[PDB]
Each structure stands twice: as C-alpha cells, then as structure tokens.
Design a protein around this ligand. Structure first.
Ligand SMILES: *[C@@H]1O[C@H](CO)[C@@H](O)[C@H](O)[C@H]1NC(C)=O
Ligand SMILES: *[C@@H]1O[C@H](CO)[C@@H](O)[C@H](O)[C@H]1NC(C)=O
Ligand SMILES: *[C@@H]1O[C@H](CO)[C@@H](O)[C@H](O)[C@H]1NC(C)=O
Length: 418
C-alpha cells in the first residue's frame, strides 16, 4: 500500500482490456450516488437493446446519499456507433436520436416546484387545470409533437456521443470480470450542456451481468424502475481529514488536457500541500508527456450550503516545477521561452515559480470543494472539485465546482484504527 506501488499498478493491479469496437448491448447501472454540476444528485440505469434502441432512466434525489427520490427522467431513442475518436484516444464516437423524454415527480413538493419551473422556462407549455401531480409521467420531449421544454431541467443526452468499455479482472484472478461503460462528461456549466461535445468521461456504469460483487448500489438500481426508483443505503458523512498521501486509482481523463495521474500530500500540522500531476498521451498512462509539481497552503474547511456532503477550501499555489517527459514537450517549452536560456530538457525538473515562464501566474488561488468516502474495502477516498469543462480555473468563490473529479485513494496515513 505504498503510493509508488499504487501508481505503478492502477486499479489494484487489474488488467484492463478495451472492447474496440465497443459492445454497449446490455443493462448498465451507477455504482453509487453520482453528482453532476448544479449540483444534481442522481443514478443512471441505461438499457441498450440489440435493435440499437435504448431506454435510459435518470433517477434524481434531494441529497448526496440518494435516499429521497425527487423526479425521474425516462429517455428513449436510437444509437449508432461511428468510429474511434482522433481527439480522445481510446474513445469511440457515436450518434443518437431521441424518441422520447418523460418526467415522473415522486413527491407533491417536486410536482409543484417542477411544474412552476417548466412554466417559467416555457410559459406556453403547461395544461390548464393546475400544477402537475406525483407518480404521473408527463412529456418533456416528443418526436412527433414538435414541442419540448427539456431546458427547464437542464437536460441533454450528448454523453452518448463518446463511448469506452473497459473489461477489468483482478491481477492474478479470472473470477470477478467487471465491465465498465464510460460515457461522455457532463458540462460543469448547465447553459453550455446543449452544445458541448464531450472530451472526457462520467464515472463508469457497471454491467448488470459483470459488476463488482461489493457494489450494493448496482443491485438496488438493477431492480428499480420509474415508479420504484433506487433507494441507496444511508452512509454517514465523513469529516475531511487530509493528513497523509493520496494517489489516482485510474488513468484519469480531464477535459482538454487528456490523461493523467495525481499524487497529493497534505500536512494538517501547517496546512501545506504538495501535488504531483503525471500527464500522459495514452489512456492507460504508459507514455508520459510532462510532470507538474505544485506546493502551497490551504484554508480550514467550511461545510458547503450549495453542495450537501461537500467541504469548501481555499487552495493557494505558491511554488511550481515542470519536468518535460518527452522531447516534443521540451521542444514546445523551449520555442515559448523568451529572455534568458530556459534550456528545457527531457527528464530535467525546472522551477517556474523572480520571473515566471509560459506566462504562468504565481501565486494562484483556487476555490475548492472536497468530500471523503470509503470504498467497499474500507480504504479512504478523496474527491476534489470537477475541473471546469471549458479549461478555466475556479479562481473566484462563485466559480467553485458543484461536482467532483474521480477519487484519489489514501496510500499513507498516521491516523489510528483502535
Ligand atoms: C427493441 O428490442 C426490445 C426487446 O428487448 C423491444 O422491447 C423494443 O420494442 C424493440 N424496438 C423496436 C423498435 O422494435
Ligand atoms: C408562468 O410563467 C410566467 C413568466 O414568469 C408567469 O408570468 C405566469 O404567471 C406563470 N403562470 C402561472 C400559471 O403561474
Ligand atoms: C509543514 O510541515 C511539513 C511536515 O513536517 C514540512 O515538511 C514543511 O516544511 C512545513 N512547511 C512549512 C512552510 O512550515
């Protein structure tokens, strides 16, 4: 359980095989309570049938534990896989056609809030007698009626345009095949969701036939429908305890920056942090491009009022070092090094932090959102804020994320257990 060991052997040393071309035929489910920008607390139950049609459930909830359903969307349509993405290596592009979007409200309060929101968004949309009632499917989109108000709920289905299926086995075992469907990332800005071409992935869905055996949420969701939405178990909220070391569980994908792993170190004795960002050109993180080392200070935590389960931090970067890891990276940095002798070299670390290179601004302050959970094995998971989809920095409080990146796993600690 050394940090270096877990970075050498991502996802507990699991061997990953990529279905190329991808086979999406089957039932795929969320592995927990997902957070989309907003925030939206939701689970997915997506069925892709052999005739290339799909029925997708999006179950929405009022909290980060997904114990109290609010409304469910039932999204019907047809999907056709095109070819391997040239932008996202390991990704496969696809085209889709919506046949229908229906909404069911699971409480009176939601029926009345949602009907009001549909009316404010699309004044000419609602029927005469009064507000919507619970447990009734209302049309938000019909393929043969010409009307629609999906903008009310900030709906779009562009996630179906980028597809990756990973097959996962334990390092030395042919028992426990886990199949994961990666669909396109959801834009962090709701308004931009209608025009966004995914360049990264949502958290993976797991196949109802080949899911991790410890995935409780998987089993609950598989037995659900629009009139019985998945009720997830109420896990207790953990308090943020940063002290120690955290590493990526996977070859991560960020919008516009592609593949990377992270190694973070937190010192709670003086609120100082270090980040290593190992950047790669490939989706199994074997071919390095450049490494960023960053160091600075963080604030005390304040529980978020915007995002149930989240803790607000301010993070300041005071120091930065860059290591080009291939000749192309060193070449690009040398071409864009003015007065003098930046002398960038493969594998040689240089401090950027009296002047700065590449017009990098230091110090740099970010407004962060963190949560801590446990995996099925009782290992601690650290989530920080989803990176803005447009490549921008959360550099003002109002630009703080309302959703999370994929989690880091703790690899060093000085906290007890008994
Ligand atoms: C596609 O297949 C499913 C069977 O799982 C069926 O319910 C659905 O109606 C079929 N679609 C069409 C257009 O025939
Ligand atoms: C619907 O929205 C419009 C615009 O805000 C408002 O003027 C109207 O009164 C609303 N309708 C109802 C029935 O509340
Ligand atoms: C903070 O504490 C860590 C761990 O002892 C130490 O390495 C680091 O130098 C300290 N930094 C400052 C600025 O005091």
């Amino acid at each position: 359980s050394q940090c270096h060991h877990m970075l050498k052997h991502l996802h507990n040393g699991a061997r990953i095989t990529v279905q190329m071309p991808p086979t999406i035929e089957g039932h795929w489910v969320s592995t927990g309570c997902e957070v989309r920008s907003g925030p939206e607390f939701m689970t997915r139950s997506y069925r892709f049938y052999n005739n290339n049609t799909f029925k997708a459930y999006q179950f929405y909830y009022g909290s980060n534990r997904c114990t109290n359903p609010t409304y469910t969307l039932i999204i019907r349509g047809k999907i056709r896989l095109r070819q391997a993405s040239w932008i996202i290596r390991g990704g496969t592009e696809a085209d889709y056609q919506l046949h229908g979007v229906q909404v069911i409200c699971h409480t009176e309060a939601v029926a009345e809030q949602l009907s009001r929101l549909v009316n404010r968004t699309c004044p000419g949309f609602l029927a005469p007698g009064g507000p919507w009632v619970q447990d009734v499917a209302y049309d938000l989109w019909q393929e043969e009626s010409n009307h629609e108000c999906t903008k009310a709920v900030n709906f779009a289905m562009h996630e179906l345009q980028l597809i990756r299926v990973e097959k996962q086995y334990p390092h030395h075992s042919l028992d426990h095949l886990v199949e994961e469907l990666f669909l396109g990332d959801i834009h962090t800005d709701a308004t931009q969701r209608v025009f966004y071409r995914p360049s990264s992935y949502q958290p993976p869905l797991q196949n109802a036939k080949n899911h991790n055996h410890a995935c409780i949420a998987c089993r609950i969701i598989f037995r659900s429908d629009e009139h019985h939405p998945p009720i997830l178990p109420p896990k207790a909220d953990l308090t943020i305890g940063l002290h120690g070391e955290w590493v990526s569980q996977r070859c991560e994908v960020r919008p516009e920056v592609l593949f990377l792993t992270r190694h973070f170190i937190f010192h709670d004795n003086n609120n100082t942090w270090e980040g290593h960002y190992y950047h790669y050109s490939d989706p199994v993180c074997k071919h390095p491009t450049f490494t960023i080392y960053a160091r600075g200070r963080y604030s005390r935590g304040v529980l978020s009022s915007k995002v149930m389960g989240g803790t607000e931090f301010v993070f300041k970067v005071n120091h930065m070092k860059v290591t080009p890891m291939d000749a192309a990276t060193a070449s690009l940095l040398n071409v864009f090094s003015g007065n003098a002798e930046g002398s960038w070299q493969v594998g040689i670390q240089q401090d950027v932090t009296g002047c700065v290179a590449l017009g990098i601004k230091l110090p740099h302050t970010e407004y962060e959102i963190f949560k801590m959970e446990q995996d099925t094995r009782g290992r601690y998971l650290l989530f920080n804020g989803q990176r803005p989809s447009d490549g921008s920095s959360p550099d003002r409080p109002e630009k703080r994320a309302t959703s999370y990146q994929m989690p880091l796993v703790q690899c060093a600690s000085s906290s007890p257990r008994a």
